[PDB]
């Protein structure tokens, strides 16, 4: 039988093990300090300790362990943690709970929202509202009397996050003031873009309330929950003075990228207030070499929620994998290496609906209706190292991808205006660091671009 005590009511004198439930509002990633030790530091809150008289108040929780797996990975602020056997002591004025997981202490994590982060990523339902989504040791037991403590704290967790910012202005630094810090700092920003730099790394494009845009590398395995359009708190970043072409944040092994639970007032306001920025992209288009990635296209709103499929899967596994065989519409990202036919003037051909044949507008047709018959030779992160380039089509005779270039099909041998706009788009598409975000439809072994248009 365990007796749970509230944070502000826990004893500072009796150095005896105490137990408690609490809401997590901040945490480092679990990190190694030497050869046999791992630490995870977090800030916790509950009904008796959540606010200084305005800025948020909290207790600190330091978890010690001998293995990485014995420490909690906090991907989201707002979830709950239950700790057994912590000793409380005052550390520079703050109530600090210490727990040696490597000895007799344990923790268990509970989802405040319907699903946990991991469950959201894998689209799974939660076993029940009383089940921990992560915990230390081989087992975790929750008694009937704990159910009310949990449900009540969840109810409170939502009230707290919906009526207060929780992560107050004193817990982070404005991106446009980042360069003025001596050491590391925290940031709260909106993810504007998630670029797959390579097989292991994502490059996040961030923008905070001050309006400054910054980039930062985010390992796929470590932070698999990053999503475009969502707001996160980055715990511990430093300003990179060696980055000249773009504003970069450096993260450490102890750094953490944290999202917010649905009821978060701060996340909600920042999601609406912080709007997309393309200034970095527009400025880079004037340079011969851009160290900044530019996503030239935008997919139709109805696919915004459709998951992406790599070129590796699209061309090497699409006829063998059960899941990929049942689908005919996909979303993928890639960069264009070459565009065929070479002559931009031949991108638009005359099409005969009856004979199913297209022809060049040589002696300028009637031979059929004008259509785009463009073949892109692409490549992506998942195929970066191989000796292949892949064919992706923009054959608009049936309407798929008709507005891709924001230029209605026309005889490019006669319409100088149309030809020029397509020529400019050609240089942009083949330019280093330019990428395409597109939806494709599989027909007779080929992929045709559809519901996708250039935004530059």
């Amino acid at each position: 039988k365990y007796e749970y005590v509230e944070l502000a009511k826990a004893s500072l004198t009796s150095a005896q093990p105490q137990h408690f439930y609490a809401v997590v509002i901040d945490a480092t990633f679990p990190y190694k300090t030497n050869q046999e030790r791992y630490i995870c530091s977090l800030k916790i809150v509950d009904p008796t300790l959540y606010l200084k008289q305005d800025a948020s108040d909290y207790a600190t929780l330091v978890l010690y362990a001998k293995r990485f797996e014995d420490l909690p990975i906090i991907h989201r602020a707002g979830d709950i943690i239950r700790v057994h056997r912590a000793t409380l002591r005052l550390y520079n004025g703050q109530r600090q709970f210490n727990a040696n997981v490597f000895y007799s202490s344990s923790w268990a994590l509970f989802s405040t929202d319907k699903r946990s982060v991991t469950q959201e990523i894998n689209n799974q339902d939660a076993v029940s509202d009383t089940t921990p989504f992560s915990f230390s040791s081989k087992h975790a037991t929750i008694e009937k009397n704990e159910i009310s403590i949990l449900q009540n704290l969840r109810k409170w967790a939502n009230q707290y996050f919906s009526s207060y910012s929780v992560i107050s202005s004193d817990m982070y630094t404005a991106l446009n003031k980042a360069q003025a810090q001596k050491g590391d700092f925290d940031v709260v920003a909106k993810i504007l873009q998630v670029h797959e730099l390579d097989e292991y790394t994502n490059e996040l494009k961030l923008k905070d309330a001050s309006g400054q845009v910054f980039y930062t590398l985010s390992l796929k395995l470590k932070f698999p929950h990053v999503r475009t359009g969502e707001v996160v708190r980055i715990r511990s970043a430093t300003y990179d003075e060696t980055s000249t072409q773009k504003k970069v944040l450096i993260l450490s092994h102890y750094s953490n990228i944290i999202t917010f639970i649905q009821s978060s007032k701060l996340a909600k306001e920042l999601r609406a207030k912080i709007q997309d920025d393309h200034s970095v992209e527009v400025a880079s288009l004037k340079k011969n070499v851009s160290l900044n990635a530019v996503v030239l296209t935008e997919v139709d709103k109805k696919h915004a929620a459709l998951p992406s499929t790599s070129l590796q899967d699209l061309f090497h596994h699409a006829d063998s994998d059960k899941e990929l065989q049942a689908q005919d519409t996909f979303r993928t990202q890639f960069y264009v290496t070459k565009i065929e036919p070479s002559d931009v003037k031949e991108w638009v051909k005359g099409y005969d609906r009856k004979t199913k044949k297209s022809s060049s507008l040589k002696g300028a047709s009637g031979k059929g209706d004008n259509i785009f018959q463009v073949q892109f030779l692409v490549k992506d992160a998942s195929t970066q190292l191989n000796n292949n380039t892949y064919r992706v089509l923009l054959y608009t005779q049936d309407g798929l991808g008709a507005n891709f270039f924001n230029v209605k099909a026309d005889n490019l041998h006669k319409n100088a205006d149309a030809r020029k706009k397509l020529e400019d788009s050609a240089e942009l598409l083949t330019k280093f660091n330019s990428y395409v975000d597109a939806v494709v439809e599989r027909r007779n072994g080929f992929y045709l671009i559809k519901d996708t248009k250039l935004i530059y």
Binding site: H316, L393, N433, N444, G445
Partner: protein, 217 residues
């Protein structure tokens, strides 16, 4: 603007000059004063912002062991070294096995001569990070590959072999295999792209473990 990292500027200029060390700015080929972060199992030195692995020639260590007797190299951790004679090369490697590389390419610091300064050498610095894990630098190497790849593809792919429109516009009763969209990028031998034009420098170097046996069998 001004690049604060000596290493980052050096390695970036090398890649932006097709691995030709003679095309890199002469005002950058001056002696390198750098702090030793680690000495074993991996010898890593910093320039105050990043850490790179120096590759010592057999001549470099023998010369060292003469002008500085008993001062072991594998124990230089937390002390500084001054590389007076050095060169930069580009090598093809397995990035999955070599952490001081990216996209199977590595820029190596070839050391010919270096002297240790144990003289309470200091310098308050930020935590050194692997140059081959840096955003901008990874991007520079991607630029390099993109350029080689594009040149190879525009040389290899010719004749506008466009998918016949009927194959797609009239695909009812037609089934196909996606691997029909796979096009070879160059005239390679295997599955990896290797059609580069920089001449891969050779230069023999010592394995960090041989210099550990030479000092403590």
């Amino acid at each position: 603007p001004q690049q604060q990292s000596a290493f980052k500027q050096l390695y970036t200029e090398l890649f932006n000059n097709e691995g030709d060390f003679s095309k890199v700015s002469s005002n950058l080929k001056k002696p390198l004063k750098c702090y030793v972060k680690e000495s074993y199992p991996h010898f890593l030195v910093t320039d105050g912002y990043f850490f790179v692995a120096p590759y010592f020639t057999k001549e470099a260590v023998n010369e060292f062991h003469a002008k500085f007797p008993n001062v072991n190299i594998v124990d230089l951790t937390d002390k500084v070294i001054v590389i007076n004679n050095w060169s930069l090369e580009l090598r093809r490697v397995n990035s999955a096995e070599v952490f001081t590389s990216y996209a199977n390419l590595e820029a190596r610091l070839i050391v010919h001569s270096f002297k240790p300064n144990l003289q309470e050498r200091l310098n308050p610095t930020r935590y050194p990070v692997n140059l081959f894990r840096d955003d901008e630098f990874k991007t520079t190497i991607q630029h390099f590959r993109h350029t080689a790849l594009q040149a190879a593809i525009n040389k290899t792919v010719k004749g506008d072999n466009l998918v016949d429109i009927s194959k797609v516009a009239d695909a009812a009763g037609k089934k196909g295999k996606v691997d029909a969209g796979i096009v070879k990028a160059s005239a390679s031998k295997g599955d990896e792209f290797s059609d580069f034009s920089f001449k891969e420098g050779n230069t023999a170097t010592l394995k960090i473990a041989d210099i550990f046996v030479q000092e403590k069998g």
